[PDB]
């Protein structure tokens, strides 16, 4: 559950920029937008299973081999 | 009927085009707006039915569409491309528009100018799905693809190509023979670098240049301020305040006064939601246009005259801006013409010759063929031209003698 | 009844000046006035460039120029007769007044 | 798998296309449409708050945009180019449209 | 009056779509030569007045 | 070699695959290299 625009003081528990997010687990590693949340956070059911929440990855990074 | 003006020189130009892409995502608790959570009004509002729920459904449609717009505009790229350590793009600058490492959010210098110059009674504002930092990575990715790999990252994987050759391509795309770039590379790099420099001064000079983005920010503040001010309205009721009515008039009479406040506040909220549905359609028309210019002007080169800055289009660079996008369209403009005598075809020995590409001209004393968009005379020859029938049918043909470059070798 | 109609900022004479300018540029200078100054070019050569833009070689114009001129002049004649003969063509504008 | 048709002749064609560009610029005084002359009724309308201004503002936004549409369509040209006095246009006759 | 102004906002948005289409045809079909099939009436496009 | 730009297909560099424009002095990053002449087999007929 996301409480949109709340600080957790007022309500696992995680503070996002979108709000105090409850029942999801914070993960530092970044992945595709599976479920959108807001302010770059997304959530998914990746595996032994729970809902995770993480900062989304915009795509694979690639330094083009220009000279 | 025998005069043509051909440009002997040109200017690279950089035209800044600014487009709205998204509104401030908004959702309103219609019960907290109308009733202030005071139960005697909520027990009346329940009797109006779907006018509670469907306004949140309508504003949720608007709120999701702001993320869909911003996704379609910026997330056209398949990978996050990033620029090499070396910056030797043939002399062409690429610094004020690439990321600045000192900027916390890795925006470019021109993105920072744009981010400076643009500027809860049951109402709620929702964050965008992509933060300003994430949008600034997509505008860096589209830019680093565009610098290192031309249009190829719009067709498949980015294929590297040296930047002077990518411009030689893009000249060859506007009917200028690519030698015109290489023979002028330092001048073209200086015209481009100077033209970028004028953008920083132009954007510094007045906030009135960003009017399209300052408008989408102003109109949403103006709509919500009016929606809040409409709480202070009677609509025929004894007072504009609900708990005041519930203290004074006894429940029977109170109900008729409150039902006016419900009707008035609800009609004001339907008016606001209807206006936002129409404003969101106008912003979506702008977001589809911006999503098109990413595809055609950034990821490509466009033949569409005056779709992509004035002059013939070479390339463009996107830069992010609050609630929108800015394109720096780079265009070739022909700039110093001379008048020349011309004829549609020439006669050799009993044969009409037409130019293969380019057009015939004379300085008044000699006849030449030149490419159409830059004066560069070449002696008229059997490879530069093709024959098509005798020396009669054409109107305004001239007499001449075409050189045939094989004949000196057939002297062997 | 408190309703009013405001004048347009450009009068129909000023629109006729702009359509005259667009048209006289298009006749004397091709596409070039959409980039630089209006570079003059002879109109038979401007059509040869526009034929070259559809994959038809320039000689197909000049070898048929007097024929092509008669086809164009006749076609404008049919437009002028068609618009003179019936009001039914202007539905897309008349509908905007009617609504 | 071995047949092609090629044109041996052409027609130049002229096709009319028609697009609307502006509504008739229209504006309403909401107090004069709703009330009209009555100071009594005009004072009663103040109880409805911002709608009188908001509706006249929306019609002003539409009315101003009609001038913008007309300039966005026709005012694309920097200079008023003048047609030359002598019509050496290789036989092509533009009298009807000049 | 609210019904009239709401319908005129929607009609004016349709006329804006037509005015942007006309400005696009002015830009491409007059000031240039379209290579976009059947954007400029049937046939291969030459010019428009 | 010279190729078409969207599919690797090497052509031997020749005076009909290519066009002249002035000296080397101004062209940044030019290299040397033979350009073959398709007339040469009958120049030496
Ligand atoms: C929330 O409350 C805590 C209380 O310690 C405060 O430190 C924090 O800055 C507040 N803001 C958020 C949204 O984290
Ligand atoms: C994320 O990084 C912080 C660094 O302080 C660490 O404490 C935390 O345990 C990490 N969480 C995960 C899921 O790795
Ligand atoms: C062409 O114009 C530029 C200015 O745009 C000028 O610096 C240059 O000297 C001119 N002539 C040449 C050499 O092309
Ligand atoms: C671009 O121009 C600026 C001018 O201040 C200069 O500092 C920067 O080094 C230049 N970048 C390149 C790589 O040309
Ligand atoms: C070309 O001719 C016109 C008219 O005589 C003249 O004004 C102009 O200076 C001449 N030169 C150019 C700029 O092509
Ligand atoms: C142009 O028109 C004049 C009209 O007097 C004519 O004498 C001249 O031969 C024409 N030139 C061409 C190129 O047709
Ligand atoms: C070209 O020369 C021929 C004679 O060889 C002559 O009949 C014809 O009129 C000349 N045409 C022009 C354009 O001077
Ligand atoms: C081509 O068609 C036109 C009529 O459109 C006709 O006048 C002309 O004679 C025809 N030419 C041929 C080659 O049949
Ligand atoms: C053009 O058409 C008009 C009206 O039919 C006519 O008076 C004029 O002589 C025509 N001019 C040409 C060049 O045929
Ligand atoms: C590319 O840059 C390097 C380092 O400046 C230089 O040594 C090399 O000669 C350059 N090559 C070209 C094609 O300019
Ligand atoms: C090509 O050869 C000449 C000597 O004939 C030499 O001066 C020049 O530097 C060479 N250029 C390259 C890029 O190898």
Swiss-Prot record, chain D:
Glycans are attached at residues 1, 9, 93. Disulfide bonds join 30-52, 35-41. Changing residue 8 to I: In strain: Alpha/B.1.1.7. Precursor of the fusion protein processed in the biosynthesis of the S protein and the formation of virus particle. Mediates fusion of the virion and cellular membranes by functioning as a class I viral fusion protein. Contains two viral fusion peptides that are unmasked after cleavage. The S2/S2' cleavage occurs during virus entry at the cell membrane by host TMPRSS2 or during endocytosis by host CSTL. This is Spike protein S2. The lineage of its organism: Viruses, Riboviria, Orthornavirae, Pisuviricota, Pisoniviricetes. The chain holds residues 709 to 806 of 1273 of the full protein.
